[PDB]
Structure formats: C-alpha cells, structure tokens
Subunit: 296 residues, 2 copies
C-alpha cells in the first residue's frame, strides 16, 4: 500500500463567464458557531442544519473571486491572511497556484471590511498586492477606518474588526492606492458596484457581465446556506443593520431568480457559485455543475 497523504487539492476553481475568466480562490475554512450568531433560537438553527446533514459548529468556506476581463485583473475580497487563525490565509497561495502573481492584480474590490475579507491585503508590513488600487464604498471606509468609532467600539470583537480594517487598508490609503466609490458605480469595463448596505454600512455587491452572462458577487449578503436560503429573513448579530440586510438579501435573491443568472458569496461552500430558484417561502441554491476549462 502507501501512507495516507491527507492534503486537500489547491483551492481554486476556474469558470468561464462570457469572455471573462473567473477563479474562485479559497482562503481556507473555519468552524463557526452559527447557532449562536444567527438571530433565532439555537434549536431552530439546529433543525435547519440537520435538514442539510449539517451540525454546528459549521465548517464555513472563506472565498475571494478573481476576474480576468482580458484587459484587467480584478480581485474581489482577499481573505483573512493571519487575522482569523491558522485555518485561513490560503488565498495568496491559491492565487499563485491558479497561475497568477500578486503583482499582476490591477484592482481589488472589497465587499466590506470585515477581517476575513481585508486581511489578505497585507503580508506583514508589505502590501500584498503592490500594484493594485483598492476600491470600496465610501461609507465602508468612513465607518471602519474611523479612530473615534474604534475608540467607542463596544466589545473586543468589534475593536478587533476596526483594528484589522485599519491595519489592512491604511497602508494602501497612505500609498495613494485607495479609491472609494459611492453607491452604484461602473468600475472597470464589465464590473459594476451595486450598493447592498446592511451587513456593514457600506457593504457592496459586485456584478460581473460579459457576452450576456452575469455573475453577482454578493459578499456576505448570505452567511449560512442551510438557513438563509429557506428563510432569507434570518440575520446575525454581526450584521450592522438587520432589517436592511434582510431587505437587500431578498432583493438579490429575487433578482437572481427572475434573471436566471449566477451568484456567488464568500461563505457559501467553496467555490460558492450557483443559480437561484424561488421556491415556497424562500429560495433554493443550485451550485454550478463541475465544468472543465481549457485554453482558448
């Protein structure tokens, strides 16, 4: 026989979208006590997860999305680097395994500034993406980079969020490489920012379109697949505005269902890409069928 290997394959998933190349990049996974963070009784979460053959704590993917439009290379979210423990921070290595170098990234779009999305921006004291311009909504940057907000943060978890956002973005701000937008904004050709505020004050969805094929990168608009597709009204204590996140999630799901296009989200099971159909009181996520990509 042979010794066991016990390693996972490189965490990248390639998919074509019209003339664009999408690469989902895994940052790793982390076990989350979702039954304690969701705004509903723990037994109800347990029953939902059991319907999906799952149990809390739940191993949850953390994913960023690389878009090569053919003229620009854009990275949507960057993982956690070392901010959330040793099971995360795989995204840079998976970017390299996917055939790219960090120096090649032209722009980085942040759905929001929670540590598991901004941590990858820094390797120690060095910019992880030395040529990239970072973009996020002005509301997001104004909230998370505020010293006064950090000084008035209620608990250690929130303080750590502020500190991580500052440590990750401020070096780019200082280098002149942070370029905010406000609300719905055309970014590089083929990618648009769609305001989806409420998980954080400036949470933004990024819509990628090429040759009639559309993909909405929803960020953290959904967090627990086995709960929030069936019941989109369930929120978490990590959402800044629970009512707004429910409204925005329902809007995104309704639009994806009506349009029949792809969505992706950072914490859907990797690669986190699929279609949505409206069913009953909520929605059914349909993960994309495994497809091989070959050179053109």
């Amino acid at each position: 026989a042979a010794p066991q290997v016990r390693t996972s394959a490189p965490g990248y998933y390639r998919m074509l979208l019209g003339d664009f190349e999408i690469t989902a990049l895994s940052d790793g996974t982390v076990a989350l006590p979702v039954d304690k963070r969701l705004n509903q009784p723990a037994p109800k979460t347990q029953s939902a997860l059991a319907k999906s053959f799952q149990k809390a704590p739940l191993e949850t993917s953390v994913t960023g999305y690389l878009v090569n439009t053919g003229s620009k290379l854009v990275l949507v979210d960057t993982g956690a680097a070392g901010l959330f423990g040793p099971t995360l921070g795989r995204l840079l290595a998976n970017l390299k395994a996917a055939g790219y170098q960090p120096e090649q990234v032209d722009e980085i779009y942040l759905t929001h500034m929670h540590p598991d999305h901004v941590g990858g921006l820094m390797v120690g004291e060095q910019l992880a993406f030395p040529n990239a311009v970072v973009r996020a909504d002005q509301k997001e940057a104004d909230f998370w980079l505020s010293q006064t907000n950090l000084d008035k943060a209620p608990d250690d978890e929130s303080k750590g969020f502020f500190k991580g956002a500052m440590a990750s973005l401020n070096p780019y701000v200082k280098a002149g490489k942070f370029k905010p937008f406000s609300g719905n904004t055309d970014l590089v050709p083929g990618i648009k920012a769609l305001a989806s505020h409420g998980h954080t004050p400036g949470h933004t969805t990024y819509v990628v379109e090429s040759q009639g094929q559309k993909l909405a990168l929803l960020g953290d608009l959904i967090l627990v697949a086995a709960v929030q597709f069936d019941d989109p009204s369930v929120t978490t204590d990590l959402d800044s505005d629970s009512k707004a996140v429910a409204v925005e999630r329902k809007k995104a799901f309704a639009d994806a269902a009506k349009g029949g296009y792809l969505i992706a989200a950072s914490h859907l099971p990797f690669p986190g890409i699929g279609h949505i159909r409206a069913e009953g009181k909520g929605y059914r996520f349909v993960p994309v069928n495994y497809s091989v990509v070959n050179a053109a």
Copy 2:
C-alpha cells in the same frame, strides 16, 4: 494586461471517512446527449434539465474513488484512458497529483466494465497498475469477456464496449491478477461488495465503512442527477435490464436516505459525493460541504 490562464485545478477531492482517506479522482468530463439516451421523451428530459439550469448535451463527470484504509490502497473504477476520446483519461494524472503512484495501488474494484470505468486499467500495452489485483463480480466478467456476446453485439458501440472490456481486463487475467467475487462479499476489511445488478449484469456497489462512517460507491446506479433523483424510475438505453436498475436505484436511495450516510457515483458532478433525503416521489441529493483535510 495579464493573460488568462484557462486551466482547471487538479481533479482530486480529499475527504476523511472515519480513519480512511477517500480521494475522488476526476477522469475528466464529457458532453453527453442524455436527452437521446434516457428512456423518456426528449422534451421531458430537456425541461427537467432546464429546472436545474442545464441543457443537453450535458457535460458529465467521470470519477473514480481511491480508498486508503491505512493498510491497503484500493481504487474503485479507473476512468476511460483514451477509449472515450480526448476529454477523458485524466484519472492517472490526478492520482499522481493526489500524491500516489500507480504502483502503490493494491486492489482495483470495478463497479462494472463499461469503457469509462475499465479503460484506465491499461496504458498502451502495459498494465497501468502493475501490482494491483482487479476484482469485479463474476457475472460482470463473464458477460463482457464473452467472445460470443461480442460476436452477437448489434452495432459498433456495443462491439466497442466488449472490445474495450477485453483489451482492458484480459492483460490482468493473463497475469493472474483478476480475482472475481460473487454477489455480496466482504473484500478487504472496511470495504464490501454489494450486488446492484441491472445497469450491467454484474454491476456492483462498494460500501466503505470506518469508525461508524459509511460511504456507498454506487457506480452507475445513477447517470443524470437532474432527472433520476426526482424520478428514479427513468432508465437509459445503456442499462442492460431497465426494471432491475430502477429497483436497485430505488433500493440504494431509500437505504441511504434511511441511514443518513454518504453516497457517491461516477457521473454525479465531481466529486460526486453527498447525502440523500426522500422528497415527494423521489429524492434530493445534498453534495458534501467543502471541507479541508490536513
């Protein structure tokens, strides 16, 4: 501008099952005219596919399953090698990418002897797995290695099935390395053969169990997920015995729904592993949650 890369990740998926290590190994994908092969009206298949955002021809995975028990390295199915065209035959390279060499494989268990499961046994005129013993049901071998069955085959597709089985398996037979079993049989500790005849005369499911964790490798008991989970009675013209395959598929789905354990199948979307629950007149497949192995 950064050039696009346009290559897929190495096609292996690692998963722990108790103390055992499972590696799903992609042989590639192939576009199949499932609307023509399923035994129901083509528009019905097309509408079922549309419900799942799919359309025929449907890109379909071809997967084998490596089980490292800690004492034996067993491979369940081998892909197509070059028998089914350019898009397949990736299993050997993915086995190497998964950190193993073909010479390490101790036993190979075949669900059945269709070309997309036996072709990988051979690389040219050389055994692909030079130290392995191959096992399959006696009924499977007797059917596909039959010279008179080949002479009786109606068209070139079926003749090609017989020729491919013969070319892939007879070098192991000649070397004394084919050991059939008959019906339900305990193979190596932790892996059992479960007769699931009907897709082929000796089609066999392999049940893997470690520390109370069970995984049933169903072979080709299901071929088109978007059709046959909702309606397990729909068969194909490639099934040797349609009534039997419907019975065996329903039995497997009901048992996996009742027991709550994992199933895998060669043509479910890679890695093709998940749970199943009973819903309406059929079943819902629940793909395993992405999980990292260390």
